[PDB]
Amino acid sequence: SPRSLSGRIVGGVWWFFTLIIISSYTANLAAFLTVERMVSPIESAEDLAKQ
Amino acid sequence: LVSRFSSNEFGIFNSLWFSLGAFMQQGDISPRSLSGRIVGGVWWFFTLIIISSYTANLAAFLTVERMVSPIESAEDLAKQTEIAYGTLEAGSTKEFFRRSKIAVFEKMWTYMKSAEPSVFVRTTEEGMIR
Amino acid sequence: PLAYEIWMCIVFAYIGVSVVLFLVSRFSPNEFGIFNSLWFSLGAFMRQISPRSLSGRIVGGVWWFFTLIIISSYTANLAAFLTVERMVSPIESAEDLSKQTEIAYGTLDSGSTKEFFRRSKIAVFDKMWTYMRSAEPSVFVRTTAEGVARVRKSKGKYAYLLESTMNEYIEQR
Amino acid sequence: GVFYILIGGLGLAMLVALIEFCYKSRSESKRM
Amino acid sequence: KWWYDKGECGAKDSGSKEKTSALSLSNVAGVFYILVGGLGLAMLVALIEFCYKSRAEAKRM
Amino acid sequence: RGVQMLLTTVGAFAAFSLMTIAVGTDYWLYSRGVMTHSGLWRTCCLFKGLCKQIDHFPEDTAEYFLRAVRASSIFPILSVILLFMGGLCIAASEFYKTRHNIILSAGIFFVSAGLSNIIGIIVYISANAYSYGWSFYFGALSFIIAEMVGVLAVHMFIDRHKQLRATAR
Numbered sequence: 016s017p018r019s020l021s022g023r024i025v026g027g028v029w030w031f032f033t034l035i036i037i038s039s040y041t042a043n044l045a046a047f048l049t050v051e052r053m054v055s056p057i058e059s060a061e062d063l064a065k066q
Numbered sequence: 067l068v069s070r071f072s073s074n075e076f077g078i079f080n081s082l083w084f085s086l087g088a089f090m091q092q093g094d095i096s097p098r099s100l101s102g103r104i105v106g107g108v109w110w111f112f113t114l115i116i117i118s119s120y121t122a123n124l125a126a127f128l129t130v131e132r133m134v135s136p137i138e139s140a141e142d143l144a145k146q147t148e149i150a151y152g153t154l155e156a157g158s159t160k161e162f163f164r165r166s167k168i169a170v171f172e173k174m175w176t177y178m179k180s181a182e183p184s185v186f187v188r189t190t191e192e193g194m195i196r
Numbered sequence: 197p198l199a200y201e202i203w204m205c206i207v208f209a210y211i212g213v214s215v216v217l218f219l220v221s222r223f224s225p226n227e228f229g230i231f232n233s234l235w236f237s238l239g240a241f242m243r244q245i246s247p248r249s250l251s252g253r254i255v256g257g258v259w260w261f262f263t264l265i266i267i268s269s270y271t272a273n274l275a276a277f278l279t280v281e282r283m284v285s286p287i288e289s290a291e292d293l294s295k296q297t298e299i300a301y302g303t304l305d306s307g308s309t310k311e312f313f314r315r316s317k318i319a320v321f322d323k324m325w326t327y328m329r330s331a332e333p334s335v336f337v338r339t340t341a342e343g344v345a346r347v348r349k350s351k352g353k354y355a356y357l358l359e360s361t362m363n364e365y366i367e368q369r
Numbered sequence: 370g371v372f373y374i375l376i377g378g379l380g381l382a383m384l385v386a387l388i389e390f391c392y393k394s395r396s397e398s399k400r401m
Numbered sequence: 402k403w404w405y406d407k408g409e410c411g412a413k414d415s416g417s418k419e420k421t422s423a424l425s426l427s428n429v430a431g432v433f434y435i436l437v438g439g440l441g442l443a444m445l446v447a448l449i450e451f452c453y454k455s456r457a458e459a460k461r462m
Numbered sequence: 463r464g465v466q467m468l469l470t471t472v473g474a475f476a477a478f479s480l481m482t483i484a485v486g487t488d489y490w491l492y493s494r495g496v497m498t499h500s501g502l503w504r505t506c507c508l509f510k511g512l513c514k515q516i517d518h519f520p521e522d523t524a525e526y527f528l529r530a531v532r533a534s535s536i537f538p539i540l541s542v543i544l545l546f547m548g549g550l551c552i553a554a555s556e557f558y559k560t561r562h563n564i565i566l567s568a569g570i571f572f573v574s575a576g577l578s579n580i581i582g583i584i585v586y587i588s589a590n591a592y593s594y595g596w597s598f599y600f601g602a603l604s605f606i607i608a609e610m611v612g613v614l615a616v617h618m619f620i621d622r623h624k625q626l627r628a629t630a631r
């Protein structure tokens with residue numbers, strides 16, 4: 016753990032930055048796995064009319 | 067129990083504070099024993115899976131919160147069956163839906179003619195109550 | 197979520213990275229010890245001391261990024277399970293009845309269905325007739341609605357065979 | 370694939386640690 | 402008409418009804434069980450190691 | 463000294479009494495086909511006033527094992543018998559404390575009985591799938607009092623061990 020003013024504020028800038036980045040990575044991977052479990056392909060003519 | 071049975075986790079506050087540090091992800095005073103480390107490894111992955119499930123379940127419910135808007139057309143009425151719908155029991159509206167040619171409105175009139183119980187009301191205020 | 201077998205590969209890689217950490221930390225002539233290295237690897241796997249050997253720290257960092265990817269994908273796939281909730285059917289085709297033996301299936305006790313399954317020549321339907329002829333207990337039902345109530349009181353353990361039009365009618369009631 | 374990149378980084382760091390320990394042992398045997 | 406329109410099932414139309422169940426304890430019950438098993442295993446391991454240390458201290462004196 | 467031992471004794475007595483009240487009645491509440499109370503043995507409805515043993519376990523194999531564990535509430539009964547044994551050991555160690563190690567084994571058995579009672583509470587909560595009975599909260603309070611009594615017991619044990627180590631030197 017550093018003890019300086021400037022080193023602590025560099026860590027606070029970079030660290031919340033990459034925290035938001037990996038939060039966005041988690042959210043976007045969750046979004047794409049939600050996309051991966053979406054609606055099955057066409058099985059009837061009503062599905063043809065629906066698209 | 068175990069930390070005072072074999073230190074820095076000798077107190078009840080140090081034990082509860084390391085238990086809190088094990089309950090959250092981050093942490094303070096690192097134990098050095100075999101049994102204390104395996105108690106931490108059991109409890110800590112346990113609550114890690116719990117808060118991961120909390121994150122996933124809150125994400126699921128916020129996904130549910132941003133889902134499909136409510137009914138805006140008669141095609142939305144045909145697309146669902148949960149929220150019921152009806153007209154007045156007597157009038158030209160029932161003659162319009164009865165003599166309709168569109169199959170969507172024909173299915174609407176078939177459902178309102180075969181509903182259990184009856185969706186028709188006698189007055190306008192009866193429909194407001196319904 | 198995410199796995200049925202890959203967790204054992206995660207544990208085996210955990211043991212391997214612990215062996216590598218003990219090989220780096222305890223061969224340089226403070227962070228030594230096989231159980232200390234194992235517990236530091238445990239602290240690397242979940243979130244919450246650090247070695248100063250400047251070569252096994254690369255191993256700890258790549259294992260630490262590795263398990264960060266693990267828990268990110270775990271949160272993502274568990275949210276994927278909790279989002280859609282798409283229940284699927286265990287039985288799809290007619291060969292699924294011959295493929296398993298836990299969930300039983302039957303026909304009516306008398307009729308042309310029994311004449312069809314009795315006088316069959318296909319070995320799949322011959323095995324079906326052999327299973328339904330030596331079934332314990334008696335899978336044959338009295339009437340049609342009795343078979344419907346037997347399926348409704350089976351909780352996913354017993355099926356009934358009949359014509360398609362009647363089944364599609366009962367499905368729409 | 371993440372197993373593959375983990376094993377790659379693991380083997381790379383292991384060979385780097387081995388060659389730096391060999392060079393440190395050779396320098397200690399030559400000097401001391 | 403006499404199968405889908407006359408019938409009382411609106412199947413394959415609705416889909417998801419948002420599934421408004423929070424979380425069952427069935428997802429948590431085996432996790433509690435392996436927690437209790439790990440705690441009891443750690444208790445027994447700590448007790449046998451303390452008994453072995455006490456026996457070694459009594460034999461060494 | 464003796465005041466902490468008397469506090470531990472009355473805490474074990476109160477925990478045993480609340481465990482007895484949890485075994486007795488009003489452990490859970492559920493609306494049948496009007497509400498109805500239950501005490502893990504039999505259910506009583508709100509006709510109104512009839513009581514019968516509604517703890518019928520039949521109508522994967524892990525579900526059958528969980529139903530067998532939830533049948534007749536085996537784990538809290540064994541936990542209460544272990545708490546009774548720990549209380550008898552503490553009462554035997556209170557008067558004429560000859561051996562200086564029976565209190566530690568009694569406290570270890572007491573903590574393990576509390577852990578088994580918490581496991582049985584998790585089992586009794588798992589088989590529930592609307593309100594809850596007051597004897598469940600009484601059993602939770604007895605679990606809290608048993609945890610505090612185990613803390614006080616091992617604190618008195620390490621105080622006696624430090625006194626013996628100071629007198630032996």
Ligand SMILES: O=c1[nH]c2cc(C(F)(F)F)c(N3CCOCC3)cc2n(CP(=O)(O)O)c1=O
Pocket residue numbers: 154156157158159190
């Ligand atoms: O000629 C007609 N003119 C109508 C005019 C109106 C109004 F909107 F108030 F002007 C209404 N209402 C709408 C609904 O609430 C009650 C009164 C009904 C009418 N009806 C009966 P319909 O047969 O059901 O159309 C006629 O027959």
Ligand SMILES: O=c1[nH]c2cc(C(F)(F)F)c(N3CCOCC3)cc2n(CP(=O)(O)O)c1=O
Pocket residue numbers: 304306307308309340358359362
């Ligand atoms: O000539 C026959 N025509 C049949 C026509 C039907 C129906 F589908 F209702 F039209 C049925 N059912 C099928 C399932 O629902 C109950 C009645 C049985 C028939 N059977 C008896 P099988 O010999 O067992 O086929 C005949 O003999």
